[PDB]
């Protein structure tokens, strides 16, 4: 078995904390964590070397985190429209 790059480890940690913060209802913190996770996942997949299977899993996680993140942006826009 093989090595997880430090940038890719950053991506997973951030995502992990995003998920935690998401479920806790701290949506503003969650959103930032998701966004930065995606930033690292994109960097890794583009400029670090990995197999097809690795790229395919990163693409998958990228999709999920941007989905949720965008949904949180829209939520926060409407929470803010209140005032």
């Amino acid at each position: 078995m093989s090595s997880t790059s430090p940038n890719l480890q950053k991506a997973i940690d951030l995502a992990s904390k995003a998920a935690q913060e998401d479920k806790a209802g701290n949506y503003e913190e969650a959103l930032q964590l998701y966004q930065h996770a995606v930033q690292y996942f994109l960097h890794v997949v583009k400029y670090e070397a990995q197999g097809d299977k690795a790229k395919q899993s990163i693409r998958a996680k990228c999709t999920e985190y941007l989905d949720r993140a965008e949904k949180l942006k829209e939520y926060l826009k409407n929470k803010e429209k209140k005032a």
Binding site: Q35, V38, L42, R59, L66
Partner: peptide
Amino acid sequence: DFDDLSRRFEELK
């Protein structure tokens, strides 16, 4: 090809 994700990530700022 990761353009769509890159496009969506950039917009998300």
